[PDB]
Structures are given as structure tokens and as C-alpha cells.
Write a protein that binds this DNA or RNA. Sequence first.
RNA 1: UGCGAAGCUAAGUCUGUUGGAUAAUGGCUGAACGCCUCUUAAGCCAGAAACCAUGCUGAUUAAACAAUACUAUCUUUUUUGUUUGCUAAUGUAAAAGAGAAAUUAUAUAUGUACCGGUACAUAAAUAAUCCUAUCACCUUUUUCGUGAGCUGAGCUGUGAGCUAGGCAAUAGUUCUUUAACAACAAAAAAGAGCACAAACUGUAGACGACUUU
RNA 2: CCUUCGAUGUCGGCUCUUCCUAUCAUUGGGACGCAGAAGUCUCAAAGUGUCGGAUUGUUCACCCGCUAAUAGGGAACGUGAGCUGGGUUUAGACCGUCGUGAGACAGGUUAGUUUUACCCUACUGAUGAAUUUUAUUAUAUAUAUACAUAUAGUA
RNA 3: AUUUCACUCAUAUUAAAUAAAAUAACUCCAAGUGGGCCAUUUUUGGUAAGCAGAACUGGCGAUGAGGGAUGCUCCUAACGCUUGGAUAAGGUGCCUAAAUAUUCGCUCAUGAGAUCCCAUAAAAGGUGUUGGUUCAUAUGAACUAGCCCUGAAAAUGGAUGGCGCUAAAGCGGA
RNA 4: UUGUUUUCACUUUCUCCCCGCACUAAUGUGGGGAAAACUGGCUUUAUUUCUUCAAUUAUUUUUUUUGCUGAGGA
Lengths: 337, 185, 125, 201
Amino acid sequence: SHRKFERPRHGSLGFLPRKRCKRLRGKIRSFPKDDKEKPPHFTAFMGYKAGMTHIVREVDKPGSKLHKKEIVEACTIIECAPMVVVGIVGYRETPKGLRILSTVWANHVSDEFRRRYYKNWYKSEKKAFTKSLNVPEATKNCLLKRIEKYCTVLRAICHTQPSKTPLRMKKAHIMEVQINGGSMKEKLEFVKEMLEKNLPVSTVFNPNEMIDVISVTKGHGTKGVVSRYGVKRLPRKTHRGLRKVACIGAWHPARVQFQIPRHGQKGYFHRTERNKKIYRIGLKTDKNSASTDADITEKKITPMGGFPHYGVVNEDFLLLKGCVAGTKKRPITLRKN
Amino acid sequence: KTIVSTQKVLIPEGVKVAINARKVTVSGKYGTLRRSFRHLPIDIRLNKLKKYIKVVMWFGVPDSLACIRTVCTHLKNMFTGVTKKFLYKMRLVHAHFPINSNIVDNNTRIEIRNYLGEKSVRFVKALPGVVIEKSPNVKDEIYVSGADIENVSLTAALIHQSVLCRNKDIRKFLDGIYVSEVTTV
Amino acid sequence: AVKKVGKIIKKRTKKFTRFQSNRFMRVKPAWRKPRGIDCRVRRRYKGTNLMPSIGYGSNKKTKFLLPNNKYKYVVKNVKEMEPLIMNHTKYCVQIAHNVSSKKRKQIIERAKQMNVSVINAKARL
Amino acid sequence: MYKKEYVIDCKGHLLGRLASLIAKELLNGQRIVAVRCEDINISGSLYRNKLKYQEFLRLRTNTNPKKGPLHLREPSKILWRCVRGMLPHKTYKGQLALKKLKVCVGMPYPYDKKKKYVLPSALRAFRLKKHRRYCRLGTLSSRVGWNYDTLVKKNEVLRKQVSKAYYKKKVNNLNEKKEIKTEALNLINPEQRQVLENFGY
RNA sequence: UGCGAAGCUAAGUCUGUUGGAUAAUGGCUGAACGCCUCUUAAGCCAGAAACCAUGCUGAUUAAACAAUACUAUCUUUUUUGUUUGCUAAUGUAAAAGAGAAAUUAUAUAUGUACCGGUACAUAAAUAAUCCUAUCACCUUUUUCGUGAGCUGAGCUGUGAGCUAGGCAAUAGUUCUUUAACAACAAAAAAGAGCACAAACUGUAGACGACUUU
RNA sequence: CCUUCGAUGUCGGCUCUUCCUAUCAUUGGGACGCAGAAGUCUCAAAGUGUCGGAUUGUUCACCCGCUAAUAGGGAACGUGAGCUGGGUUUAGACCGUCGUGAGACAGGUUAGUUUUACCCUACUGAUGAAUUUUAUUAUAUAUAUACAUAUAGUA
RNA sequence: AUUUCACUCAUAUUAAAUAAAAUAACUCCAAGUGGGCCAUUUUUGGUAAGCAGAACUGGCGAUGAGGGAUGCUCCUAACGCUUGGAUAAGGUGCCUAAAUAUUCGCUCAUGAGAUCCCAUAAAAGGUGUUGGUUCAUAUGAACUAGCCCUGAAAAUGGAUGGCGCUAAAGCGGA
RNA sequence: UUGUUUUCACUUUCUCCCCGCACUAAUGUGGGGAAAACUGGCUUUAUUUCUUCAAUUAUUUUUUUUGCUGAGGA
């Protein structure tokens, strides 16, 4: 018969299966729709979760209980050393999805980049990317011309530089950032002129801008149904324990439905949060990265004693309003809205 | 099931027509109209030197025969629209809140304000080949003109239906925009 | 199906097996008529272990003769060969299993000079 | 039926009739390739067929929809599923017959350059009275969630251009070959001439 | 007993889109039915927390796939064959000309020439069609096209043909017409690095697995 | 009285999921005996939500209160190897009525053992090979090819 | 009434027809059985029931085979082992052997319809379309009955058997 | 309480006349009139190989190409 008292289900079915993510790296499921009118521009960036702090800001919300008063807000610091652009990949639409036409590499790639192709770099001969890079420029131009003629989606391969971060990891995180903007003629030249130089965060993002964050949540191993789905604890008198779901289905269908909460893995899930506002883009060069015009002190973003479990942020960073999924040192991919 | 049924439509003087595979094209001093009738089984015999076009259907059951006069009336509407633009005079009626109509975008995309004092802009875009302006004689009148009867009439209907009132007695709150009359230029 | 060599037609091969003997070890394949109540085979449901009938009987003109088109006769010594002297072309001889190599050679040679074929001629040598 | 494979153009073909003919051919061990599957027609209004597909879509196994009827949205896959339903696919021979069929949307690289056949027994122009509603499988799939209709149209117009160029070249070659023939036909012996024109060559 | 970092944690903090096509309904043009009619004909419009997309999560859910980087004695033709557990070696769901690329409309189409229109051709049992097969050999006279090598150009070979000549088939009446494709083995000729483990890590964890050095 | 008496654990609550629509609220409409407000009838619609307590074992019920609304139902009267055991429904005992009595009560009351998963499947998570009679939305300097293409490892 | 003598009443087809009618009749010994159930038709109780109780015959039981997708009882038809032929019931778009057969009408369904048992549908309606009947100067009416539509709402996801089918692969014929 | 008889009305035109006079689906047409007589029908004479001699039934005689089977041993 019907339930005596209705109440909404536990957890969202939209994040199923709650299994471990394939990779530690956040993967963009989709990039923002291409706008032809805007000039060519990058769309995503990569950084590392250094920790978080709090800031004070003056609110300018008329008709609000806060308005002119000053407010403390939590903010996440994501260390973003400049990314290095190393490749171009062209996509073309087919009724079977997007098809790669080809990828064109730069004339030189970092050892940090090449490390990503190795599981045992220390014992390897490091022969990757050694003789495919001296290809004649004529074939390069031919491949770019074919990409211009046939492709309709352009992405630039770019990688991080963990050597500029306190990470123990040495192999670079590499990912493709889609170029959104003018026609392919302009996209190709826009990426070609940047085919080897560093890509700073300030080029991709501006302050006071809303961005999305893609990252893998903090892992917790296998967790019970109470923690994993928030089901209610059974009364203290329950015979074989109380930390479980009492009825896991009616008699019929004579199966267990997939909508029933069960024990299993919790955390280490891929997540894509929207609308995180950039509060400040702090630069490596300046000594007043953490100073405001109302503070005029000489200080950098790293708190005294260092960011716990991370280290010191000696590079560019962005102060993100709110929290972001993942532990410290977790790679966070920032995506344009 | 009748064997053959025909009906004749005279071609007015200032119009030039062209019919191929029941795809009619009508040209006049007020533009060009283009209609397709490929959803009906018909022969369209176009006579040019003696004007007129005859729509003939073979083996027509009454349900299909009903469409002969529909096609003929569509053709004559095309003629009249291309020789003298169809005009729809609309009236803006209001009880207490005068309706502020503003015509922008070279006589397209009319905007309506102050409907029941809502101070929220409503707007409708005229269908292709349709011109909206305001009457120079009566202050609360709107002219919706064009060659295509369906287009101009649909634009007038869009204007009328964009300004319906909700949650009130419809028979007491009479204000809105209504097609006062339909004529030609 | 039927097997037909010469005039001898064998109306059925692949001897009948007991119902369920394939999937029970305690049930030997030797045919037993199933009594049952709802027995499938007894009711003659299609596609299940048809039962032997008299209709499968081979014709009596060629019933008991071997592929050599003659009847077999099992002998234990040379004395039981005497009746074969008259019908040596209607009977073949098979030596009994418990006959020694002493006597098997004697029976083989006697059948040879008697002009009667031996079935298991090359046994125990 | 007796060719290595039959390439058939599905444009303007009724889905069920086409599937039945294809299934019989496949069961008789004939390999077929169906192209332009997004132009298949279906009798009945577009709204009616959309309602039918929504009823199909509402149908999944309650316990675990992964196991449920995989719905599919490409018109090629829809035609493939219709043929499978018209076929004993749960046997070995039926599975072979099903796998002997290839379905495409548009005309890809091998099949745009070979002769496409048509089944007149399943053509809409011959099987539907002109006053009765029909649907287009491509638009139905688009309304259901295929979202690749326009790209197939683009590829199709491009293929139309290249086919037009090929056809013009072929027509010129045939004209020049006919001109060669009509003159070389005067150089053969007169009795050979008589035989050729008697039998119409 | 106080305090209690770190780590977990909520009672704390942050974040939680817009498009298409529709239903009800209201309408447009408009016959049936000289009028009228939202269509209870044809042809259209606007339209909902619903539907489908977008976005998000998986994708050993597709026994799926692509591009890239590097590498394993390896890679191309001919002959003979595949008639201690092994160390030569064979399989076909379909060869017998398995021949055939325009597009489209179905109360019409297609090509060409001008500026969707005009004009003219073409097609309208369309595969009920067209195309492709047998002229062996060798010798003579020769004609015309393509490959190697040579310097737009000469020669050799190849393909097709021309004139003239003689030159073969035979296994007793058929038992599949051993004729296809792909692969493999042997022998000849030519060219041609990684991963696991280990120690470490702890962004991970029941164990595997995962992140690292 | 059709199946189950060599046993399908028979009330309620708690927990948890899903489904129906005969829609309570929310979305957009039509009608009104519709001025506005409030409301009533009704259509498309199941996306979202339908509560805290006092008394009673209760379902049902009835009050207090919040709410936007506190809609109706199904899933072996969903759900006991999920719990609980208050009731019912063994054996102890008390009362009332009935019986000569042993005892009876669809009368009341109190106390009264709630067993097993390590199997298959399902579900939740976690490793993981193998995959050619297999696959192909191309590959080739405005140009041919399926009579083709594709070895394998790591990443 | 009995008995005995006479005469004689078709029989060559046989005191009407037809009859694998003596496969009869009789006697003895004995097994199992003595819970039945279903269908057509009839019928009692009951609001009704896959309910309870009866009558006739045929079946199921005790019995498979072809068909009805599926099914103890429906249709065809009852059974030794085979080879050919031809059919019954039922079918011939594919599943699936055989007609995308021929010929004539009807039907468009924003929950069409599609083989006895059989797997529900009614009163009441329709200015949907098709064909008839009777009244009024090619019109207005009133009827009528075919298909279609409303009436027509339930719980895991779902079933003319499935796919699907509309110049039917639907309905009624030939 | 049956027969019998009588009347008009029945056809083709690539014919003509008038009206609309191009109005048609139309290489024609609508309405109203005339005409004979090809067309159609009938009556005679000759023929049925120019052509037809059908269909059904009864009663008979063959024929093309082929599937399966060969019991027995007087």
C-alpha cells in the first residue's frame, strides 16, 4: 500500500553510479558554445587547490539587509602557474560525433610534458617525442591548411608546470583547451602564434568573472548508507545494527531496484560546479598579492606557516569565492561559463 | 465520386502569374507572393493570353472537392493583395490606462506599454512582408498592411493575442487591441 | 533413418535409450518403458525419446542375417561344426569367447577346410 | 539476392515494407547496405509517430534501465531495429542474417560511388494515397533526440555537387562514345551491320 | 580532569542553466454549406512545473572507436607446399560476368541557354536496359595507344589491330568444370623500447585498484 | 473454496523505494449566478511537494498547530533471515457473566524465548582479460580506390 | 385349448429399406472403479461468479498429432515403421512454409483495427464520412445503418503474439 | 375478370443553322433547332482460311515435360 507519510528520496539519481572516477584530472564534458563574433580566445585553465582563507568585502546590494556593511567570505586559493601550449588538435563533425583530423605539435616540448607519457621515466630512455618533432615545416603547414579547410572545432593542447608548484608530482597534467572565437582562419593563427610560449591565467580569465570548476571530490573509501546517502538511523533497539536501510524494496518486482541506497564508495567523484566568482587574480611578480588598498601592508597570499598540506604559493593564483571540490594539491580545471 | 470538377479564376490586369507543378508565383506592383499547393491533387491550367486559370480535379470525393474553392480563393486573395495591399485597421481600447504603442525598426516590431498599467514592455515582430504603422487620422488606430493576406492577418492576430488580460473578468475588462476592420489600399 | 544395404533394410539404428538416462547416473541407458502418470515419453510428446514399437521390426526374410548376408552360429569346439557342412553358405561361424588358443586354431582350420567363413577369425593371436 | 551485396537507397521508402523486404533478403543470405536512412517515410502523421515513439521511450526495466530496451535515435539504428524485430535474431542463423545488414545515414565513402537500388514495392509514391499523412524518419529522430539531421543535410548537398560533376563528365563520355560508335559502325562488313540493326544494336 | 593542533564533521560555508517541439486553450486564412466556420477539410500561428534536447554523471552501459608518442630483427617479389603435447603449414554463411555512382517529382521530372521565371530539348513498361566475354599458337607485312631506361623528343617493352601461311586439341557416355578469396610454412631475390615487480608517496585505499618519486 | 495444512511467518508502527491519477498545492487555460478580493465548476498535466504533535496497539478516528498543500491509492492489505512486539493468538493468574462440574466467553486485565545467509540471482561498490568472418562517415596530389584498408605493445 | 392328419402361404432378391449383421448368444472366474470435470443446448438457487445443483450428447480424465502465438476440455483429426501424392482446420508482408495475388466497396483514429472458445464494454451522443427511406420549390428537414469518433481512469515497463501495416499487412465480400 | 391491341421515346455524327458567338475538361464547349443513316439495327443471296465458329454440360480420343516406387521370383 501507499506510504503513510511521503518524503523526498535520499540523494540524487543524477550522479549515479557513485563509483570511483577514472582519473584524478578534471575532464571538461563540454565547452561553451562557439560564438563567431567574439575574437579567438582560450576557454579553460588548470591549477591546483592550495587551500582557502577568508576575505572582507564591502557589499553593494541595495535593498538588502547587508548593503553598506562589510562582510567576511570564505575564498579558495588555486595556484595557477602559467600553462604551456604545445599542440593543436582539429575536430570535424560527423554523424558519429566529433572526429579528430590530426594533431600538430610544437617544435619543442618540455621534459615535464614528456614525463606524462611514461610510467617509469627514471629508468626509461626518454625517447618519446624525440624524432617526430623535426618534421619539415611544409608538412606542418599542409596539416594546418587541411585543418583550416575541414575542421570546425579547434583545441590547443596545453600542460601545467608542476615544477613551479610544491607538488611531489613531476609529470605534467596535459589537457586540450577549446578555442572559441572567430573563423578557423583566425583560430589557427591565434594558436600558432602561441604554439610554444607560456599561457598565463590573466589571458584566460578576468577578475570579477564567474567560472565553472571541474574536479574530483575528496575520497572517503567505502562508506555506509547513512553517510553515503543520508538515510535515517534506525532506532537503538534494532537487532542487527541500526546503520542501514530497513526495507530495500517491496516484494514485487522480485529484484532490488537501482534507486535503493546501498553501501559503497563515497567521494573521489567527478564534479562540475557552476558560478564561482573570481575575487582577485594575484600575480607572481608583485609583493602585494594579498594586500588591499584598505590594508597597504606588504604581504603575499601564503599564510604564515604555509598553506597546510600544500606549501607556499610562489606563482600566479586566483582567489575563488566559495569552496571547490577536491583535497589540497588536487588539480582543478577552471572553465569559462 | 464525381468524374471531373473545375472552377475558373479570372486574372486581374496588373498581375503576372507563373504556375509550375501547382507552385504558383504571383507578381504585381506591390511585391511578389509565392504559394505551393503540392498537398492537393489538381491540374492548374494557366491561360495567359486570355487570362484566367482553371483548377480541375478528376475523380474527386466531396472531401477533396471542398479544396477547389479554397485554392481558388487563395489565388484571388494573392491577386488582390499584390494589386492593392491588404490592410487591417486595429483599435486600441482602454478603460483607465491608455495603451502606449511605439513603432520601431522601420515599421516592424511594435512595442506596447502601459497595458493595465503594467509598465512591462510587450512586443510583436511583424511577419515577413508586413508593415505596421499608426493611422494619421484616428489616434488609437494601427494599420497592418502587406501583400500576403495570411501574413498580415496573422500579424494582426499576434498583436491582438499578445495583450490579453489574465485573472480578471474578461467581459468587464474590455481593454486591448482589436481588429476593427479589414480592407485594402 | 532407415539403412538399406543390398536386400537387407534396417528400419532404425541408434538403439532406444531410457528416458532421463542422459542426465541421471543411477538411470542406465538400457530401455525401460516408463509408466509414470505425466511422463512426457509415455504420452508421446514430440521431441522426446520415442519408444520402441513392433512397427520397427525388420522383415522376417532378412531378419537375423549379418552384413555378410548369412546367419551367425557360435561354436565352442570342432564337434559343433558338423551341421555347417550342409549350409556353409547360409551360416557363418563365431568362436565362443572362452575358447582357448589350443582350440581356436583347430576351429579356424576346420572351418577353412569346411568352406565356412569365421567372424572373429583373428582373435587371440 | 545473387549479387555480392545490394546497396539500396532508403529515401522515400516506407519503413515497415522496406524492413520486410530487407529481412527476407537477409534471411536468404543476401548482404544489403541501406543508405540515406534518414529519408525513410512512415505512414501516419508526424505527431502520431512521435506519440508512438514516446510510448516506446516510456518503456524501460524498472529494476535497472541499463538492461531495458535500448531505445536508439539514429534513423539508421531505428531501421536496423525494425529489421531485427522482423527477423529471428535469437538463433544462430537469424544472428547471421542480422549481421549481414549495414545501415548508414547519408552516403559514406564506399557507397556514394556504387549503384543504389530501389524497392518499388515499398516506395511511398506507390504505396500511400496522396491525401493521407506521412512522416519523415529524420525529423522524427530529431524530435526524439538525434540532433544530427542538419549535418546530414550538409553532407548530402556536398555529395549532390560532386555527383553532379561526375554525371556531367559521364554524359560527355557517353555522348562521345556514341559518336564514335555511329561512325565506326560504317566500317564493319555490311552483313555484320544487318545483324546489328536487326537485333537493335 | 582542563586545554587540545591535524584529520573528519553540520548545527557552519559555497553552488544549483536555456532552447526546440508540443498538450489544453485562444486564434489566422478558408471551403464544405452563395453566408459562416480555429479545420467538427486541406494549409498556418501563439502556447504548460509536462516531452525532447542543453547542461551534469557513468560509459568492460559500444565484448565501441579516433588522433598522437615511442618501440618489437622487421618489411616487399618468385618457387614448392599446408594429402616429450607440439615445433612446416588451411580456413571460408557463400566466385563461376557475384558487371553497372545523378538528382528529383509522383496531378510530372531532368538538362541546356538567358533573366525562382521564360524558352527549347530530353524521359516517361523506367535493368523489358546497357556494358562486358571465346577471334588459340607460332611466322610475315604492318597501323595506332601506354611502361623501363635516354634526351617537349627518338628507342625498347606492353595493349589493340592489319595481310598472308600452316599448326594443336582426341584419354572411349557425365559423377565438382579441382578454376574464387584470404592465410600460412619452407626456400630464394630486394628494401630495414617499454611495462610489471621493488623501495617511496597518500591527492587513494577492505584487498586489488588509484596518485606519485 | 481454485492453489497452499511433510507450514507462503497472520495487526500496527518505524525505515526505504517505486508506481497510478480518479490533481490537494504548484504550472498554463476555459466557465461562472465573475466589479475587485475570495471562491466554485472544469481542461492539459504525475515535473515538484504533501508536515510537527496530545489520546489510542491500533488501521480508522478526533483535536492542537504550522503550511502552499497538509490529495486519494497500488506494489503478496509493499516491506518481521529489515526492526519492534503494544495488540491478537499457547502454557501462569485475576474479575464479570455462563456451566452442577471439568471448563467457556467475537468480554475486560496483567506477565509471557521473535532462530539461520557464508549459496544463486538482484542491487551497491571493486579488479579484470579476451574479442577477424570483425570493423569502417574514409584514405590517397580541381585528381583514384571496398577487387581497399586494419600487425602488436606501452602511454 | 391341445393333439393327429390333410391342403398351402412371396423365398428364382429374400412377407418394407439399409447393414465389414455371428465381431453373435450364453456360462464361469476375477481385476480396477464407485472424489470427477469441461463444452454446446436446456434448466434450478443466486446480483453474479472459473459459484452451487441437475438433463442430453460429445469430450477431458485415459490422448498424443496439425491449427488457435500461449493453454488438460476449442477447430481439424485420434497415433505401428517408412517413401511419394493430395488435403482438413488454418493460413500466404517478415518472424513463418505459402499471394506485398486479383477484383469491389468502406475506414484516418492527438490512445484506429485486426481469427469461435478468447481474454470486457454500455446507455447516450457527433454538422466525420458512406449508402438508403419519407416529406416539402436543388434546395430544407426527419429518419435509418455501415466504418470512425466521444462516452473509455490504476498502479514494475508492455503487448492485434512481435515487428510493423493506411494504393493495408484493417473491415465486409468475391 | 386473362389475353389481345395502341401511343411516345429510345442512336451516331470528325453534318448544318441560331444564341454564348471561344464561353470547353477538350484539337472545343453550353443551350436551342434541323439533316441522313457513314455508325447501329433489321430483311434477302453466296461463303466461313479476311474473320468467327465461343462457353458450359454430357459423351469420347489423345498429347508435351517430368517426380516417386520395383513387393515377388510361381
